[PDB]
């Protein structure tokens, strides 16, 4: 008739030998059909052997049908251990604080284990709510091989896909704490990530190492912020300052309800499940507790208990669990590390909804940001340097300022105009200067030179000019689409292998080009003999190269096709012309440098063909490019 259940509870820690004994169990809600019989025991420090031995020891003949575990400890592992016993016993066990409350691997379905910590998924959701509240859209995840990874990655993925906002996941990192590193492999990866908001997931101990490493990497500082799940903060009583300040994490509150109140919740859940199971089958839940022998008969029947126990309510409070065994929605608190060692609350979060206290700045163009300095070099007609009128003191008309370290020089021309239209269309402002070392980029042995150097050194974002295009430079830097038809070409007065050898022809023939050019490099790559022969015929400058052609002492000149065509059109006398139809091999066009895959990039490209799209380029061609010669047409 009288149905008195048998129950046991344990507290570890409590910062006391003579830890508060039997504070609770006092009859409450006695109306529940089964009355609890309680045996309380405490043990000071946790061990797999101590815990296993003791719990089995309490099992004895005693036949307890339920267990609640609680700890002062920060230890992750404990929950799993007790869970293992549960798997073996089929005796329900749950825990109200600390490590047992700390998350664990997905529980075996047959097994019965419960935790008063929040669900991993739930926690990830709260982390997302926190980021959304501060509107931190862009973030990355650092994780470790500890259990719940990929349940976490998946949960974040699910939570993220649904939202309208254009948030960015930058990187996800999985590093095994096992195979501990000489390589600082974690340092080597962590160094890579550029993202402002970082979610970390690991064991309490692991967070320390990852954080020391982050401190070496420089990831804890200045604008980057870190957000953490329950596990790292754990108890929150003890905090190695290896953790950076401003670290943001969620945890269950001690203040709202003290540990004995929580234990009362556990007991209430066990006896309520017993009462409901009673109501359904009028059957005593009591079972033989002894682990050493085979599990007692009809304990196999116990599965339904779990089925009953998942959602339980008392005191107007819901204990409802999730299939994993975490409670569906325990109340949760948003916590931050206040300066020094303080864990000071920031937010409260419950059920569906979250509320946070601080307004702004916790702990400039909306469309786009930063500034771009540009480098160029002077070449006619395209980029022309002129000396500004000293009386005026500053540049006039179309001329835009450019500085050369050695004095203000005034640049105007094709690159200046194309750049100007582009700047007008994409709507950004820019600084223009002149290159010093090596003009257009030049390679001596291992190292690059020229504007490309300033593009690589990040002293220039984009390089503009008469610069030709080639595979190497396209490899190192992204190039704009070609605006003009150009390339290598010949200019002379008036594949045959006549170029290949001079010596075949008895009189000495002559042809040359400007050194450190894309033309000369291309020549050396494909045709060696021509380079080795032409080094003697190389000329200082295009005006001087022209001096070698014009006054005699040189037959043919070779150079960029656009320049040679404009020069074809413009000459003091029509003494100079192009080769054939001026149809050029190595068909190319003038491009524009950018850094790498990250750049305004495509936005530029569109702007460019819009320029031809409105037909401006034809006008600009007639004005700047068109020469008077080629007059007999």
């Amino acid at each position: 008739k009288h149905p008195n259940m048998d129950i046991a509870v344990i507290l570890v820690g409590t910062t006391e030998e003579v830890a508060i004994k039997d504070v609770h169990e006092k009859d409450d809600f006695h109306h529940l059909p089964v009355t609890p019989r309680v045996e309380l025991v405490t043990m000071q420090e946790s061990d797999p052997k101590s815990i296993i031995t003791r719990i089995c020891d309490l099992m004895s003949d005693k036949k307890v049908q339920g267990v609640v575990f609680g700890d002062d400890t920060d230890q992750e592992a404990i929950a799993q251990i007790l869970d293992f016993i549960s798997v073996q016993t089929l005796t329900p066990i749950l825990g109200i604080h600390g490590g047992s409350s700390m998350i664990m691997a997905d529980k075996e379905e047959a097994s019965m284990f419960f935790q008063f910590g929040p669900s991993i998924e739930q926690q990830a959701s709260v982390m997302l709510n926190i980021m959304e509240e501060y509107d931190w859209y862009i973030f990355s995840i650092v994780t470790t091989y500890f259990p719940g990874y990929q349940d976490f990655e998946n949960k974040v993925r699910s939570t993220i896909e649904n939202s309208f906002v254009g948030w960015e996941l930058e990187e996800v990192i999985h590093l095994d704490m096992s195979l501990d590193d000489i390589d600082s492999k974690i340092q080597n990866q962590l160094k890579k990530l550029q993202s402002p908001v970082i979610l970390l997931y690991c064991t309490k101990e692991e967070a320390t190492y990852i954080f020391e490493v982050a401190h070496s990497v420089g990831l804890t500082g200045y604008g980057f912020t870190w957000i953490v799940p329950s596990l790292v903060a754990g108890d929150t009583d003890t905090v190695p300052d290896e953790f950076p300040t401003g670290l943001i994490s969620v945890s269950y509150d001690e203040w709202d309800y003290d540990l004995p109140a929580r234990v009362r919740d556990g007991i209430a859940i066990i006896t309520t499940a017993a009462s409901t199971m009673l109501s359904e089958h009028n059957s005593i839940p009591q079972s033989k507790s002894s682990c050493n022998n085979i599990q007692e008969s009809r304990v196999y029947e116990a599965h339904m208990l779990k089925r009953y126990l998942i959602n339980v309510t008392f005191e107007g409070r819901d204990l409802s669990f999730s299939e994993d065994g975490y409670q569906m929605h325990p109340k949760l608190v948003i916590i931050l590390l206040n300066q020094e060692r303080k864990w000071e609350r920031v937010g409260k979060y419950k059920d569906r909804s979250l509320k946070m206290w601080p307004v702004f700045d916790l702990y400039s163009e909306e469309h786009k940001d930063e500034h771009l300095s540009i480098v160029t070099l002077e070449e006619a007609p395209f980029v022309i340097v002129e000396d500004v009128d000293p009386l005026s003191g500053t540049c006039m008309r179309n001329t835009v300022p450019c500085r050369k370290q050695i004095i203000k020089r005034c640049c105007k021309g094709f690159c200046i105009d194309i750049l100007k239209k582009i700047a007008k269309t994409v709507k950004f402002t820019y600084d223009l200067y002149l290159v010093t070392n090596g003009k257009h980029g030049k390679k001596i042995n291992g190292v690059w030179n020229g504007m490309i150097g300033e593009v690589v050194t990040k002293r220039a974002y984009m390089a503009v000019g008469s610069l030709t295009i080639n595979e190497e430079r396209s490899e190192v830097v992204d190039f704009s689409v070609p605006f003009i038809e150009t390339g290598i070409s010949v200019m002379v007065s008036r594949s045959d292998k006549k170029f290949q050898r001079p010596n075949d022809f008895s009189p000495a023939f002559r042809f040359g080009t400007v050194p450190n050019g894309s033309t000369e490099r291309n020549i050396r790559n494909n045709y060696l003999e021509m380079h080795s022969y032409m080094v003697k015929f190389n000329q200082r400058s295009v005006q001087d190269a022209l001096l070698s052609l014009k006054s005699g002492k040189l037959d043919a000149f070779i150079y960029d096709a656009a320049v040679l065509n404009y020069m074809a059109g413009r000459d003091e006398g029509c003494k100079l012309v192009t080769i054939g139809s001026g149809k050029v091999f190595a068909t190319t066009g003038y491009g524009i440098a950018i850094q790498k895959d990250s750049g305004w990039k495509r936005q530029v490209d569109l702007a460019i063909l819009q320029l031809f799209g409105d037909g401006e380029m034809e006008e600009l061609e007639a004005l700047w490019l068109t020469g008077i010669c080629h007059n007999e047409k």
Binding site: D47, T73, L179
Partner: protein, 658 residues
């Protein structure tokens, strides 16, 4: 001074304990005993998990073990009876090495992070299957797995192997364990074309699998079976089908060889370890230590990298999961309802034993693996020809210029001969037809062809609201499914490409212009650029060229001049130039050059522009195209295409006129 470094183990019997201690002593004798010594501790398996875990914490860890070895018990209880130790040692990060646990669930570092083994899991067996699949060239298979960490892991591993290749999920089939009747799922399996099967399950489940499979006669020839070691063994062996292919791991049964070797590796690992400094002894006893052992992960790291390739068990190296690498299996066959070694597998390469191959049912050798295609075409003269079948009689014995009889097939298509337009039975013979039948001999498929009702191949058209209707023409039939595959001379372009999958090009050609020789500078012709009402330039509206004109902005002005005086079909377009009605004609070369040869009164000029290729259309969803391209390439390499173009492009009379 000597230092005694303990090791610990759980083994089946006291004799094996003696074997363990003996191997340990061999390790001590053969490595410096002055610097360090190794000591051995071990215990028999206990009836429950708990007695054993208690044994580890009390009987073993009190001896300060640097590592633990574990073996499967004499009578397996449930499965993964060495589950507890991996957890128990794991708390302190003490490395554990299993001898007999081929179980896959230990491969995840997350749950068991201290676990290493001298045997590969059942999942790793897939390495064989991929190699097996590799040799026989069956890319199409079916996978049957039980539902659990084991089966799903096997699936993940095999699929990961396939991921390097184009991912191959020909089909995958999941069933849940303990289910006596599986019939429906196999009924679903038969529908899948691929005739080769691979399965992983427990012995009891496998009995049910073979039992259900035999009912539907899937054990028959034309079907192949590949399986795990567990499947061939036990009660499953009794109900097993003939000709099955099977696997057995070498020395899987023996703990002792693995003992000698594992301990050898442990010794090498330790001696390599103590070369390092800042070492700490493992915790003394379970009691009083809540903290991990900092050395343990390092011990794991060296031990995973520990080489010593010479061993009693075979080559030793460890994968990332701590699972063994380069293990050897012996392939097994069911000949005369008995197990025989057809071959043996060691390292990354299979080895073929002298024994004859067996396949299920009767085969001396039978590697067989893997129902209608509606094909559509258009009337294009070079690659397709149309003549009606004479009366009821079918096709002419007409012969190619190289002596061969011309092949031919029946095609239902639009006829303009009758005043109304009936879909008319016709005979069609072509380059594309010879290609199609070439495929048909190569490919399992059978073909029935009917020409599309519309003379046009296809173009987007009709109504404004939403997006309404669909591109008129054979392409439209492809999306509609009127024909599942399109064989014709179709240029390949992105606008179409998003809608459908495209076969690798059989031909490479570009647009060009036909003008009579007998008295156009470029794709860009000033004469085009200088259009004239007096000088016509003609094309077909809705021809893909027109799509080039409409889609492209850069020449968008030039389109309109072409739009004027358009012709409906290819024959009329060639005729206009021949009739001299139109001074110039613009079309892709492959259709045009053959005609250029055919008359020589007319000539092609300039450089092929809009350089493109001709390919066979299929829906992205249909996997047969994957083979088609694969076949197309195979047809290119041998010069099959070159000889076909050589046959169908006559080249007989014409030259550069000037």
């Amino acid at each position: 001074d000597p230092k005694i470094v303990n090791i610990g183990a759980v083994l089946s019997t006291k004799k094996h304990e003696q074997i363990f201690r003996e191997a340990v002593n061999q390790a001590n004798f053969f490595h410096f005993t002055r610097k360090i010594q190794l000591n051995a501790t071990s215990v028999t398996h206990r009836p429950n998990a708990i007695q054993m875990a208690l044994s580890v914490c009390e009987d073993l860890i009190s001896s300060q073990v640097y590592a633990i070895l574990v073996s499967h018990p004499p009578a397996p209880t449930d499965h993964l009876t060495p589950t507890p130790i991996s957890y128990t040692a794991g708390f302190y990060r003490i490395p554990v090495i299993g001898l007999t646990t081929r179980m896959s669930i230990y491969s995840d570092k997350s749950i068991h992070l201290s676990f290493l083994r001298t045997v590969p899991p059942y999942s790793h067996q897939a390495l064989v299957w991929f190699e097996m699949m590799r040799l026989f060239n069956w890319n199409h298979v079916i996978l049957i797995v039980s539902d659990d960490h084991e089966g799903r892991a096997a699936q993940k591993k095999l699929e990961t192997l396939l991921e390097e290749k184009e991912s191959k999920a020909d089909k995958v089939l999941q069933f849940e364990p303990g289910t006596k009747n599986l019939t429906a799922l196999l009924l679903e399996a038969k529908e899948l074309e691929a005739r080769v099967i691979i399965l992983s399950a427990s012995e009891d489940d496998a009995t049910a699998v073979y039992k259900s499979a035999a009912m539907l006669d899937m054990t028959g020839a034309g079907y192949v079976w590949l399986v795990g070691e567990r499947e061939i063994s036990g009660s499953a062996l009794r109900y097993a089908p003939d000709g099955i292919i099977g696997l057995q791991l070498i020395n899987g049964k023996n703990e002792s060889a693995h003992i000698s070797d594992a301990v050898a590796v442990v010794a090498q690992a330790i001696h390599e370890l103590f070369e390092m400094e800042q070492i700490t002894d493992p915790p003394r006893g379970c009691v009083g230590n809540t903290n991990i052992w900092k050395t343990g992960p390092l011990f794991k790291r060296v031990l995973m990298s520990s080489k010593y390739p010479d061993g009693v068990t075979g080559r030793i190296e460890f994968n990332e999961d701590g699972d063994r690498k380069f293990a050897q299996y012996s392939i097994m066959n069911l000949q005369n309802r008995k197990l025989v070694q057809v071959g043996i597998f060691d390292g990354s390469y299979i080895i073929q034993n002298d024994r004859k191959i067996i396949w299920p049912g009767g085969e001396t050798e039978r590697p067989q693996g893997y129902t209608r295609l509606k094909i559509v075409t258009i009337h294009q003269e070079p690659f397709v020809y149309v003549r009606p079948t004479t009366s009821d009689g079918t096709c002419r014995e007409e012969y190619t210029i190289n002596g061969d009889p011309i092949k031919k097939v029946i095609c239902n298509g639009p006829d303009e001969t009758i005043p109304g337009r009936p879909t008319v039975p016709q005979c069609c013979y072509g380059f594309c037809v010879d290609l199609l039948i070439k495929l048909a001999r190569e490919m399992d498929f059978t073909y029935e062809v009917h020409l599309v009702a519309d003379g046009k191949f296809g173009t987007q058209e009709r109504v404004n609201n939403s997006n309404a209707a669909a591109w008129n023409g054979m392409m439209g039939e492809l999306l509609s499914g009127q024909a599942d595959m399109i064989v014709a001379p179709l240029t390949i372009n992105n606008e179409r490409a998003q809608y459908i999958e495209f076969s690798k090009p059989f031909k490479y050609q570009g647009l060009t212009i036909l003008v009579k020789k007998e008295i156009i500078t470029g794709i860009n012709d000033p004469r085009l650029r200088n259009p004239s009402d007096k000088f016509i330039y003609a094309t077909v509206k809705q021809s893909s060229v027109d799509i080039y004109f409409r889609r492209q902005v850069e020449l968008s002005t030039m389109y309109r001049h072409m739009e004027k005086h358009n012709y409906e079909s290819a024959a009329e377009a060639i005729q206009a130039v021949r009739d001299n009605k139109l001074h110039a004609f613009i079309w892709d070369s492959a259709v045009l050059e053959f005609e250029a040869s055919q008359k020589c009164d007319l000539v092609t000029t300039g450089e092929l522009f809009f350089r493109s290729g001709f390919g066979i259309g299929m829906r992205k969803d249909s996997p047969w195209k994957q083979e088609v391209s694969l076949n197309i390439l195979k047809s290119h390499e041998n010069g099959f295409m070159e000889e076909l173009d050589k046959t169908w492009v006559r080249y007989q009379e014409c030259d550069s006129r000037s």
